[PDB]
Amino acid sequence: ELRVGNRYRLGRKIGSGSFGDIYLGTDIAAGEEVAIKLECVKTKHPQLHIESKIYKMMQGGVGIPTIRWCGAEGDYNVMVMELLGPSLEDLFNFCSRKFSLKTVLLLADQMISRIEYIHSKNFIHRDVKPDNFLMGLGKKGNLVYIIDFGLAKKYRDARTHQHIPYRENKNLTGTACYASINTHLGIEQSRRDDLESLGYVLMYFNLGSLPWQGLKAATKRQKYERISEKKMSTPIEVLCKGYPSEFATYLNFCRSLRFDDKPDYSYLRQLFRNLFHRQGFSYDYVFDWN
């Protein structure tokens, strides 16, 4: 029987992540289902070990999955991960690509907090998108988790908190559709960029689409140019027309942050909390899918 170590039976592919695919796993003894990420070792720049280290530095945070680095069985590096529930994109689809305002705001409160927590541990995520947020299981089915640290980067020194310098970006980039304007301009990402991307995710949930999705017959690398140009030419006020002004205020705030600023996470959450409460909502974790 093909197993990881002696413990995790390997199953079918269940998805993709940064730098490697994900397969279903079954603790032969415990019966518990896990996710197993595999990275081919044939590369001069391996990433999965680094990613496992970041997860380990985040462990114990609310909404951070538990992982196990297992080193290299033959041609693959192996990381075993807590199996979570559906992603927010999956749940958006279960909801026929319509979320209520209450659900968007329930999600927004937790997603800002998840990003704040990563930042508190000295990293930026750099690939904020719907598929990297997933709901927990069972008791923790009301908790939003954030996943995938393969593109994450330290933005400040752990001992001195000296911020990384403002420079042209060197590292690989996340999805074009949710990238910040600074990323399109070739500047190193910092805390502000993670939060700006979250603003595009929230407006995606509000709209069902973003105005820069949908593309032209081209080289694909042109396709990135198309997304960049439409995003930069679309004012936040046009993007957010017809939705509560807090979504536009949120995005303007993130765009106006200085590179090394500590974002006012509380302000951003409070914009949405006071909107949520003005509608008579309660933070009772009853999402549309419940």
Author numbering: 2 to 291
What does the paper say about this structure?
Mutations in CK1δ/ε (hereafter referred to jointly as CK1), as well as PER2, exert powerful control over circadian period, altering the intrinsic timing of circadian rhythms by hours in vivo. PER2 is regulated by a CK1-dependent phosphoswitch, where kinase activity at two antagonistic sites functionally interact to control PER2 stability. We discovered a conformational switch in the activation loop of CK1 that regulates its activity on two regulatory regions in PER2 that control its stability and circadian timing in mammals. We show that anion binding regulates the conformation of this switch to reshape the substrate binding cleft and thereby control substrate selectivity.
To explore the molecular basis for tau’s altered substrate specificity, we solved a crystal structure of the CK1δ R178C kinase domain. Both WT and tau coordinate an anion at Site three similarly. However, the mutation disrupted anion binding at Site 1, although it led to only minor structural changes in this anion-binding pocket. Unexpectedly, we observed a loss of anion binding at Site two in tau, mediated by an alternate conformation of the activation loop near this pocket that sterically blocks binding of the anion. This alternate conformation initiates at G175, three residues upstream of the tau mutation. A rotation of the backbone at G175 to a left-handed configuration dramatically alters the configuration of upstream residues to create a distinct conformation of the activation loop. Two copies of the kinase are found in the asymmetric unit of the tau crystal. We discovered that the mutant kinase can take on either the ‘loop down’ or the ‘loop up’ conformation. The activation loop is not stabilized by crystal contacts in the alternate ‘loop up’ conformation and was explicitly modeled based on good density in both conformations, suggesting that the kinase has an intrinsic ability to take on two discrete conformations in a switch-like manner. Taken together, these data suggest that the tau mutation allosterically regulates anion binding at Site 2 via the activation loop.
